[PDB]
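Quick one: sequence plus nonane SMILES, need structure tokens.
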Amino acid sequence: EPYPAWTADSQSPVSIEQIEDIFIDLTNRLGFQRDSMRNMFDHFMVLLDSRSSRMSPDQALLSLHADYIGGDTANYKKWYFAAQLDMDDEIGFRNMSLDNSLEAADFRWKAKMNQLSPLERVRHIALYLLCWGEANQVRFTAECLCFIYKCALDYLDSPLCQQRQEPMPEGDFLNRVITPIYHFIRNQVYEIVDGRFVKRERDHNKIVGYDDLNQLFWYPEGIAKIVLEDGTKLIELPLEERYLRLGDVVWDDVFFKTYKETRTWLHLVTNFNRIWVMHISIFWMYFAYNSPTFLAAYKWASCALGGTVASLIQIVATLCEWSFVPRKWAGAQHLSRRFWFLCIIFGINLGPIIFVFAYDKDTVYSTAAHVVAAVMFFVAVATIIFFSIMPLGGLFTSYMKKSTRRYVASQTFTAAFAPLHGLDRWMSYLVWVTVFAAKYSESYYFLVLPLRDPIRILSTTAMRCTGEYWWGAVLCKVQPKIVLGLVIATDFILFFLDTYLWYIIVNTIFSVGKSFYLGISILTPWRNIFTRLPKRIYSKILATTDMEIKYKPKVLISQVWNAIIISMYREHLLAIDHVQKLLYHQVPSEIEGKRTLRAPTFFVSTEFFPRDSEAERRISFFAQSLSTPIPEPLPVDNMPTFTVLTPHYAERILLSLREIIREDDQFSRVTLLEYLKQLHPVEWECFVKDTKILAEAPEYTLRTRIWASLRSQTLYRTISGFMNYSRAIKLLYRVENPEIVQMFGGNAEGLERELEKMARRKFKFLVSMQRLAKFKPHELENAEFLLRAYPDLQIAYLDEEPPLTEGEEPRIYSALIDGHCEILDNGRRRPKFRVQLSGNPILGDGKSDNQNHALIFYRGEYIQLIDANQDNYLEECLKIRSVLAEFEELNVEQVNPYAPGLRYEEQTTNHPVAIVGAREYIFVAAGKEQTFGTLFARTLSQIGGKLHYGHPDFINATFMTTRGGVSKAQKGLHLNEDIYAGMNAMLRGGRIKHCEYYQCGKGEQMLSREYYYLGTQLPVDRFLTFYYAHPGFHLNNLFIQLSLQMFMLTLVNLSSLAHESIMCIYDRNKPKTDVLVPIGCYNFQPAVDWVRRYTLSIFIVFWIAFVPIVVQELIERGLWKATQRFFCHLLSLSPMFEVFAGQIYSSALLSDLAIPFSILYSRFAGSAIYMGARSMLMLLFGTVAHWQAPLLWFWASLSSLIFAPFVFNPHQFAWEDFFLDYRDYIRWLSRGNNAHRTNLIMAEIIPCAIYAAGCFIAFTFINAQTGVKTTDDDRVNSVLRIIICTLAPIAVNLGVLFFCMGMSCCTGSVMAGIAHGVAVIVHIAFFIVMWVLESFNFVRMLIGVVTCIQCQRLIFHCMTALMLTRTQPSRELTAKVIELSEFAADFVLGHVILICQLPLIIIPKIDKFHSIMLFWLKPSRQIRPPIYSLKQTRLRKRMVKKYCSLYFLVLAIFAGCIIGPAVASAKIHKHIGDSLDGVVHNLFQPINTTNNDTGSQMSTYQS
Ligand SMILES: OC[C@H]1O[C@@H](O[C@@H]2[C@@H](O)[C@H](O[C@@H]3[C@@H](O)[C@H](O[C@@H]4[C@@H](O)[C@H](O)O[C@H](CO)[C@H]4O)O[C@H](CO)[C@H]3O)O[C@H](CO)[C@H]2O)[C@H](O)[C@@H](O)[C@@H]1O
Ligand SMILES: CCCCCCCCCC(=O)O[C@H](COC(=O)CCCCCCC)COP(=O)(O)OCCN
Ligand SMILES: CCCCCCCCCCCCCC
Ligand SMILES: CCCCCCCCCCCC
Ligand SMILES: CCCCCCCCCCCC
Ligand SMILES: CCCCCCCCCCCC
Ligand SMILES: CCCCCCCCCC
Ligand SMILES: CCCCCCCCCC
Ligand SMILES: CCCCCCCCCC
Ligand SMILES: CCCCCCCCCC
Ligand SMILES: CCCCCCCCCC
Ligand SMILES: CCCCCCCCCC
Ligand SMILES: CCCCCCCCC
Ligand SMILES: CCCCCCCCC
Ligand SMILES: CCCCCCCCC
Ligand SMILES: CCCCCCCCC
Ligand SMILES: CCCCCCCCC
Ligand SMILES: CCCCCCCCC
Ligand SMILES: CCCCCCCCC
Ligand SMILES: CCCCCCC
Ligand SMILES: CCCCCCC
Ligand SMILES: CCCCCCC
Ligand SMILES: CCCCCCC
Ligand SMILES: CCCCCCC
Ligand SMILES: CCCCCCC
Ligand SMILES: CCCCCCC
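Reply:
Sure thing.
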């Protein structure tokens, strides 16, 4: 018997016979495929059965007609009111507010659909379904389908076609109006070569995709660009004669690009322009206030000048946005009409300032110069507030004239955000008001106020040196100012980290506080969740409130709790003597003889679960998750149907048999069977017990296959353990209604058949086996076994068939095979349906296409789309009637969507819910426990919303199918393949909520076109919430790294200034003896104290935003480790010990986010090492020149970043694997061998030149002698040293290369060997010559080496960029030179690293310790080869002993290169060399001069 909720009622308007005739009529008179008509007829009736199972059929049909075409929710009405009768701006106006006109048409539409007959509505819905089920891959472009549907309906509703009596040929709709569009889509890629298709290589800015292809149908002036074959526009023809000529149009003169994304940094200035306005514009005022050194009017005038900057960003953003949209495409006049209103505000804000600034000096105008400057400070505060609110894409729009288009993007498909009202609307303002209040309040007292003394000191004090030779002392006189500039600049980036710092705190405080105020899970009443289980199971899993005959509320709970436990036992998770204490036992009544129900001892108040196993983990969560409020479920006779999708490219259905044993000692450990036995050694015993009991053969082989496949990672386990929905639905049905059992008691087969029939009508499984036609003969047997095991599965695959005639592409179908179909002699089943596609439906590279070709067969109302590896245990598979109630449609009352009056302000179902994610974060003794809970909460709140925006689990099919698909992938767009659907269903109108009582079971997109639609149009609270989660987290990790390279550049300048000064001794209590006791000195102690207050605040932002993830990634073990650490540090150094222990976290994180030395070192060089060395030399110079106390907190961090990958290797430190690794390293080193274009050159040259000038300036000043009291004609001429020590090694390399080329002209291994040998030695010797030139002074030599390295790097980069921007011998010279120079660095830098491990090998036994530590870290299927005989042992010892001598000789050479000048610095006691006229005092003039010219001396000049 057929669909029983529509066909078996006496109130349905139309019968199935009158429904099938309509589907046959349209097929006959339009040419739809016969197998697609038979498919959509079943999909339309299943969808009408379920929705009519909880209401009346007369209302079910109306609700279906109001959700596909015609209601306020349907996408067709929204397209009709926006691209067929204009009226796009009147929709944006209404949304902002929350004869022609708008009501005069909305009322007409609403009163026209109200007088339709039930037999006339079916004809409307079927026409949409038949088009949607056949237009392949045009489903990604929703609007094309609406246009085609309108054309077809117009043709069918004209009286002319009625007289014609010959029907269109079959397969016409596909070969005539759908195939040209697909041919256009495919040809934008995949150029044809001689025989096949290959990926055409072209710039990713001339490739139109689906987003550009469907965007043409949003405007009436976009629809009017369709040109036919002959040349005329398509609008000329009448409405009725427009469908026939729809195959003549050429889709190549009609489609354009419409976004055209540019460079990356040009997008961030115009998308998030409300973050650069409320930070920079206030950082200006804060400093301009307390900086009098550049009266009282000038103070307010210079503070109010910060309203000009708050408008300059708003001008430079509109100017950048001018280069995204096309020229004349709708939404361009608004840019030009807004650029001329921004200039007026800029002019007004800059006007009176020019007056007040330069018209005040000692004239009679003080009366009218303070009033004009006090009002500008209040005008330039209105501008800052008005530009931090009021989205960029929507301001100055009320005042605009009619024009044509008022907005820049469509306000009905790009901006329809759900209002989010209720209580969250009020709790969303508070979170941001408090955050910004706290940030702006404490960022002024601890970051800007204590910086007003160094500003006054450093801006006035002047130096006295001799100076250089080409520019005298003009550069050494203004040093303090150069230091002050860098100090402010590096404190402008630390102003952006603070606001992300406060967002973490104020978002955890609210979560904890509200979860306490709601009283859910207060403290931890652990013996309460188990205490009251039955009352919760009787009201949250059974729908008894509408079942009546209230009787025996314990037998039902008994049945449910017995089944849930017996299943766990059957999975071999509990012992047989263990389940007896954990089950509802029934015992006969000794009083009379009747029956009695008992309860478990576990369950009223002893190894209840074995050693905190998976059984404990599951029964804990199941009982703990019923506390949270859960909506009341419906009876199992009224729940809607649903479906499960799963893709499959190439996975393993089963373990085979050769793969289970194989060979043992050729990989890790032994055979996989014994591996699994060792991993889980109790259920193997349960399995063998059951096998013996059954045996009380190949089938044993099959059972072993099954037992292995349920473990490891296959596709059979997902299907086997994910089909528990069927068992749950049968169990709930039989438990709920007992009368059905008694009517035919004694017929177990009949009862089973009834239950199966009911549970087969409410759950469908669908797996999309792509490329099933070309499986191997062994691989197809597993697929054939799946259908035999479960005779209700459904598979969809891509068939194929030879072309009709030679020369054309083959025709490929799309087929579905069930498990109840009859088998053929070929060994394959007859497909139930076969729909012809229009070509290879795979053009991308993701899984989107595979999900798309099989989305036709999705019968139901909701979809759970899963991955290829899921668990979904049975206990969490029982509350499926409650998670489907999040889609709040099950308990409502229908209100006849079409009705007179009731305008669109007082409706309720306006924003339906689209996606429903699942709960993804899986979890003084009392004080320690509370602190641990708070730390876990803080760790969760980091990803409480970060990874939870659009991760989809359930999908509203009706909503997310008529507009786009379930997910999209293309070469053009690139979001995440998984975050696109959730971020695109939010700005079409839908909502996104998520349940928290369900276990799931599991930048390059800054250039997207949806960040542009979101960050330019969202309201303020929503924009801040969106920004500080996805883009803000990625953009924060770039500021932390950028604010640690600006610090090393100011430390060098500020420590090269404290090394040549007297410093005016200063006490930090009350140093107001304003005589500056060393008399004549200049005090820099407050400036030097700034370093102490920066290291303190750069580690707070580290111990709150990077350490809490150690809990997440170390929750494996560490409770006992923490207990042991507390025991071993109960009376230790306390804070000092904790601080020193706060260094292993960086190493752990680095190694976790991170083996031969060659590969290990080459994988990290260029990302953490090449920067580490250059940032370590600078720190060494800084810590040698002045040695501030809080500077060794950087040494640990920089030393634990380049030593982490080399400490967590399995076997490295023993004695000889090290030397074999060294052998391999040496061999590899010997044979290693490694305005449209003005942005490429400046992308990587400007920051590499500023960083070089910053070091050159610091190097010149330390040589420029100060306080020396000499004559003018001394100077130092220190510039020439840099030129000598920079370009000379390049000259030597080039000369050697030329000489060796000539010698080859008149066995290249020796060539390379000698070249490398001289290249290393030249750099090592010119390291020494720079030390010699500075008269053997270490401190003023380190800064000479660093600047030489920087200048060489700059030269190489610029030369490479030039030689590739703009001759072949020149190329083969420059490339070789660059490689030969970089080889010396690659030979020195790593080789030093490998020397520092020398003292860590002399330990008599270290490998045992290291192995113990790494094994505690994790075991990984260990292995140890005992393959050792005399011959190779002798060879091993020979080679190991032979290379140790070279390893301890290179170390001696390096040590003798350093100790030499350190002992040769004593014998020499005079100046070295005397020259004149441009090289005078070339080496370094002073040998015994002093720089302490302080004391009673009253007036001296010493120029
Ligand atoms: O790229 C995608 C993935 O990015 C992952 O995050 C890493 C990010 O951690 C890395 O930044 C580090 C810096 O953190 C490090 O500076 C240290 C500070 O973090 C700390 O607070 O203070 C010490 C003081 O010594 C600093 O050294 O410096 C290194 C040096 O390069 C940076 O790498 O940057 C990576 C590339 O930008 C980035 O990938 C993220 O966790 C993943 O989720 C993401 O997929
Ligand atoms: C005194 C001895 C050393 C002489 C060093 C000669 C460098 C000669 C020039 C060069 O090689 O400079 C850089 C490499 O700098 C470095 O190794 C700096 C670290 C040096 C540590 C020395 C410790 C004693 C090239 O960097 P890249 O262009 O590779 O960076 C972009 C990514 N590819
Ligand atoms: C007003 C603030 C200006 C900030 C400019 C920052 C420039 C940084 C240049 C150096 C970056 C690191 C180069 C290795
Ligand atoms: C009743 C009006 C409430 C307005 C709330 C605005 C919140 C703005 C937060 C960010 C300010 C910079
Ligand atoms: C009159 C002397 C003015 C000197 C200004 C120096 C500014 C340095 C800015 C550095 C930014 C990275
Ligand atoms: C009036 C003298 C100006 C001297 C040149 C200053 C250049 C500053 C560049 C700073 C780079 C970090
Ligand atoms: C001050 C912010 C202006 C935009 C900064 C962009 C940083 C990333 C560039 C790649
Ligand atoms: C925008 C310039 C405003 C000039 C005001 C002058 C006032 C003069 C009062 C005597
Ligand atoms: C929420 C705190 C707002 C500012 C409180 C007062 C700060 C000090 C004013 C003197
Ligand atoms: C809400 C945090 C406010 C912090 C105020 C810091 C200054 C306290 C008074 C000096
Ligand atoms: C002169 C002070 C030196 C302090 C130690 C510098 C080297 C530290 C290596 C960890
Ligand atoms: C952990 C290493 C500590 C080194 C201290 C160096 C002190 C130098 C004082 C001049
Ligand atoms: C001295 C600073 C006063 C306040 C500046 C404007 C703050 C706007 C939120
Ligand atoms: C500082 C102003 C930059 C403006 C860039 C305009 C780019 C147009 C292609
Ligand atoms: C003494 C009269 C001063 C009036 C100032 C008016 C300023 C208007 C912007
Ligand atoms: C001399 C002090 C004048 C202060 C004027 C304040 C005006 C506020 C709108
Ligand atoms: C001088 C103290 C200024 C404090 C400003 C607080 C602003 C809160 C929005
Ligand atoms: C960036 C936050 C700095 C917080 C400093 C607090 C200092 C307390 C003594
Ligand atoms: C203000 C944005 C541009 C900054 C200079 C160019 C940076 C290129 C990496
Ligand atoms: C801090 C900006 C100063 C502007 C006035 C300079 C004369
Ligand atoms: C534009 C800010 C400075 C004005 C100076 C006028 C002399
Ligand atoms: C001196 C008071 C400091 C309070 C800090 C609160 C975060
Ligand atoms: C005469 C000035 C020469 C400057 C050279 C800078 C590298
Ligand atoms: C005194 C001139 C300005 C110095 C600071 C610029 C950031
Ligand atoms: C905030 C400006 C950053 C410029 C340098 C980017 C590498
Ligand atoms: C005459 C001033 C020259 C400055 C050079 C800075 C690199």
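DSSP finds 63 helices and 13 strands in the chain. The first strand starts at residue 191 and ends at 192.
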